[PDB]
Design a protein around this ligand. Sequence first.
Ligand SMILES: C[C@H](CS)C(=O)N1CCC[C@H]1C(=O)O
Ligand SMILES: C[C@H](CS)C(=O)N1CCC[C@H]1C(=O)O
Ligand SMILES: C[C@H](CS)C(=O)N1CCC[C@H]1C(=O)O
Ligand SMILES: C[C@H](CS)C(=O)N1CCC[C@H]1C(=O)O
Ligand SMILES: C[C@H](CS)C(=O)N1CCC[C@H]1C(=O)O
Ligand SMILES: C[C@H](CS)C(=O)N1CCC[C@H]1C(=O)O
Ligand SMILES: C[C@H](CS)C(=O)N1CCC[C@H]1C(=O)O
Ligand SMILES: C[C@H](CS)C(=O)N1CCC[C@H]1C(=O)O
Ligand SMILES: [Zn+2]
Ligand SMILES: [Zn+2]
Ligand SMILES: [Zn+2]
Ligand SMILES: [Zn+2]
Ligand SMILES: [Zn+2]
Ligand SMILES: [Zn+2]
Ligand SMILES: [Zn+2]
Ligand SMILES: [Zn+2]
Lengths: 269, 269, 269, 269
Amino acid sequence: AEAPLPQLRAYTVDASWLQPMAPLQVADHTWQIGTEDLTALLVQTAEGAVLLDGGMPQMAGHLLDNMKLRGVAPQDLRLILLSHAHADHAGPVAELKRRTGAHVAANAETAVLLARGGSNDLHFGDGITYPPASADRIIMDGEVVTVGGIAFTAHFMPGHTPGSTAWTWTDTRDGKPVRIAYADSLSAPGYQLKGNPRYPRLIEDYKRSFATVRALPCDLLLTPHPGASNWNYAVGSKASAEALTCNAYADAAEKKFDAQLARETAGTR
Amino acid sequence: AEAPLPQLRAYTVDASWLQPMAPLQVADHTWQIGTEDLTALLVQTAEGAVLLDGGMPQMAGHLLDNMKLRGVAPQDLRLILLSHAHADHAGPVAELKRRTGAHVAANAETAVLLARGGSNDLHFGDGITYPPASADRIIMDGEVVTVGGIAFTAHFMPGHTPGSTAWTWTDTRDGKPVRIAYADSLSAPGYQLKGNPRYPRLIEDYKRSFATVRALPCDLLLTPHPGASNWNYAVGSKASAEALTCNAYADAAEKKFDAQLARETAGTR
Amino acid sequence: AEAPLPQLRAYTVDASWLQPMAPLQVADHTWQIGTEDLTALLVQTAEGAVLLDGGMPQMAGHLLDNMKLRGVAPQDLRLILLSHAHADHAGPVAELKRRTGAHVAANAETAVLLARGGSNDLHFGDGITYPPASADRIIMDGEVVTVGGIAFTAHFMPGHTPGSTAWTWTDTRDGKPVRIAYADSLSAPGYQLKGNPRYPRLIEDYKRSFATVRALPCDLLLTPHPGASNWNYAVGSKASAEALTCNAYADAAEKKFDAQLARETAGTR
Amino acid sequence: AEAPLPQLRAYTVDASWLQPMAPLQVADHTWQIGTEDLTALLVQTAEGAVLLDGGMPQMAGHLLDNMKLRGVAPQDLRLILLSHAHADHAGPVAELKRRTGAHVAANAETAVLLARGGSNDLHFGDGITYPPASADRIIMDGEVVTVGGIAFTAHFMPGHTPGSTAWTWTDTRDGKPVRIAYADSLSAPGYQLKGNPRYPRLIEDYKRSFATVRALPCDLLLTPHPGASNWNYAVGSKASAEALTCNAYADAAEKKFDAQLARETAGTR
Ligand SMILES: C[C@H](CS)C(=O)N1CCC[C@H]1C(=O)O
Ligand SMILES: C[C@H](CS)C(=O)N1CCC[C@H]1C(=O)O
Ligand SMILES: C[C@H](CS)C(=O)N1CCC[C@H]1C(=O)O
Ligand SMILES: C[C@H](CS)C(=O)N1CCC[C@H]1C(=O)O
Ligand SMILES: C[C@H](CS)C(=O)N1CCC[C@H]1C(=O)O
Ligand SMILES: C[C@H](CS)C(=O)N1CCC[C@H]1C(=O)O
Ligand SMILES: C[C@H](CS)C(=O)N1CCC[C@H]1C(=O)O
Ligand SMILES: C[C@H](CS)C(=O)N1CCC[C@H]1C(=O)O
Ligand SMILES: [Zn+2]
Ligand SMILES: [Zn+2]
Ligand SMILES: [Zn+2]
Ligand SMILES: [Zn+2]
Ligand SMILES: [Zn+2]
Ligand SMILES: [Zn+2]
Ligand SMILES: [Zn+2]
Ligand SMILES: [Zn+2]
């Protein structure tokens, strides 16, 4: 009686990443509409809405529910933007496109990973996947995408994925501008950093990306994993109280990266 | 403490579907190289090999091992053909393409489902998925694909999937021709047959496909699930003893389909 | 001084195919907005517009101009449907998608040809091409697509292309229903009909498609080339006067097909 | 009698770009097999051949002819690499893939442009297009691709296109190593350089790419347009005599770029 091949293993996550929350207002037009521990930002304009990230694949219905609470019908969603195309951020994109008619704008690296459904990941292989989706517009570094007069600027910050992107826009609160920076992850979870044949310039890209994050226009920083920027979505009006600056987020990420690099030289993860 | 969204659920299968077996010769050039309960046929020519189906995603390494036992190095695999693009038959195609340089030939319906990784299935939704892969050649009904002088003919038999295909070729044994028919599944597992908005002509297609299977050139029938044609790969040289004819396979499938249709009218699965 | 390789040759067409016209009303909601000799139908609903075909690639701006004359802003175009994915009918689809955010719904055969930009055509090779575009929804035979409460039904009629489709919907005029049938081309221009290795069942498909066209619900027939159904868009309110029935269109196409088949047997085009 | 829309215009080129030539040996394994004025490099190994660029779409048959003269049958072509995905360098890729079974390896930017057939170009729009093709392997900056033991290293040099790549490998001649650098174009033909909304960091990318080219391992430089590196393929064994170094090629390109930038500030092309 010899061993059969192993069964496929599902991508399972902490319960808080799947815990629905009601819409939490970030600025006049901008709302967190994902789960307690995964960001999905809805930006509402007079000419339709923009969604930045959707979380896990199973979050599609919840996102549509929260859009409805905000007055956004499915067909009112015009545009989906992404931080990076891993299953816990781009998971429901294919379903959202089918149910809303929204288009996706992303850089070429994010587009190719999204079209693979996250398979053949440089570090994860086929372990963390989701339904594939197509990008409808390819964007370049620094390119501006505008919906309802609100301009979103892309800032490439490769490392966590080759296509990792920060998005910036200026909202308002109390009559004053609020420069929002939605910066992507700077983690390298389980990654081989040095001499990686699938990503030879990984270290150089991360190092440049720390600098890119430090330089973002940033009155208020948000991140795909809210804990990375010290947000606590579950506490409502105090959710943003402890939020990091872009400088502090980059500094923390670089210290962690440097320590991980030294541990890899020392033979451990 | 309210319920979080459910975790993703992996596509799990009976252990026998994942139980490796050594190559089992079907005819002079044709070998079963999959698992005990999933067909993957290797056809070896003087100018490279053809693979018809690969089974589950986790079978890629085993298939390459069996190819090596047959004298087929990875780069010797020229062509992948498919019965249908469900995860338990097309599962390892993307990985095989990357590791062998083989091309995929398939009809348009199979190509679109394969490129989705089986997501947005007409009946399964996103429940049964696999790494997406691209077809390199689109084939039409009755089209002949030739490798090393061996001609493979496609016979469309829509129903189980819109792109379901039977493949026929003539091998030899004991100096005599053996017309092999690799006919696709004719099951409708859990499908809504009547008035299905995603497949309005489902019943008409199945009915035509029973006739197509009856008419195949067929000295020896094989099926993606070997039990459907009464093969038992685990018993070696007796594996083919009880194999059905194409007529008998079509008849059994049609009786099951008609009974399921009546049960659906009677309100049950 | 030996001959260089030939220059690329552009797909050039009769001037009337490129001659802009103002919107011509077909029924209460339905307008011809293409050129004098290429159909592009705009169907306007309370929840956005549908475009059936766009003509040649250079027609994108003209279509948007005519949409504006009808009160349809670019973002109001929700859906693009196609008769078949040749350059003179799907030509501007990629550009329209980028400028409107519309989605494309098409069958798998049309989707694969559209994604090739018409290249590797079964009969034309690479001679007649256009910017590639992706389908966003794959439709099956008989499937209903609804926008603003108006239901469009797909009727597959393979032959002219494998993915050739007739679209039907019911509009109104003078308080009475008008069953509109937009039937695809039934021509085989320069095609090898018999024993075509790239389309082995071509004759069988055309023969079935003549029957499909005869059976369409049809108070008013329109065709991608208006002359094929005896429309004359240039004469305004008399444009539809001489229009054929579906029965007469199918009969004329079948007689032409049978004559061409006999000429092919007799060695001529 | 008002003007019809303009006819489509073919991409026409100088006759020398389409003038076939016999294979010209560059090093022990490496041959120029394109036309007098467009590079297409064949690298022949014990385990199959690599093609770097193919020229214009109409060059497919000529390339296959020259491969045959070199002893390379169609199925012996294993891999296609590209400098950049414009019609005059990637033109015949789709056809070559269909006729050889070769795979394409390219970066994400090149993959997305190739899959568009060069349409929606950042600078050319839809004016310069070719049959779309899919990449089979996505490569990263500095990644090594190996065929028959010969290692090809990718060096990203964005500017002329976002995906512009230099490829390096070490061949031999007279028992000594020859480090070959196939560097992409550094021209900006008709491009808006400053404040280009579709390429906001164009100038920064070109400036970094001049430095990348200067730093390439380079005993012998070749370029997609041979005149850019002072090759003259038509003079046979003297073809390489006047070839530039990488330093000189970068310097000439940067001086031209700086002059064009000043002219753009001065309001001219
Ligand atoms: C695989 C692609 C996304 S990358 C997809 O979902 N498509 C491509 C064509 C239509 C639609 C579908 O199959 O439903
Ligand atoms: C959180 C990341 C995605 S940003 C992830 O999925 N990881 C991190 C490494 C492994 C894998 C997992 O959770 O299983
Ligand atoms: C999503 C497609 C298959 S349908 C894919 O895997 N591609 C497309 C381009 C290259 C390669 C890859 O991303 O590795
Ligand atoms: C055997 C089929 C594929 S041919 C399958 O995966 N089924 C049948 C219906 C449900 C699902 C499952 O096993 O979970
Ligand atoms: C080639 C595809 C259509 S079949 C395309 O245009 N795409 C695919 C991703 C984004 C967009 C683009 O490149 O502009
Ligand atoms: C009218 C058809 C498309 S429906 C066409 O483009 N043809 C017909 C055959 C040749 C080619 C041409 O006009 O050059
Ligand atoms: C459009 C793609 C290349 S990007 C293509 O040619 N395909 C995709 C599937 C098969 C093959 C074909 O249609 O011939
Ligand atoms: C030589 C370049 C491609 S590298 C080209 O095609 N150009 C340069 C600008 C215009 C266009 C043309 O020849 O028409
Ligand atoms: Zn991630
Ligand atoms: Zn994550
Ligand atoms: Zn199945
Ligand atoms: Zn199965
Ligand atoms: Zn046509
Ligand atoms: Zn036409
Ligand atoms: Zn170029
Ligand atoms: Zn060029």
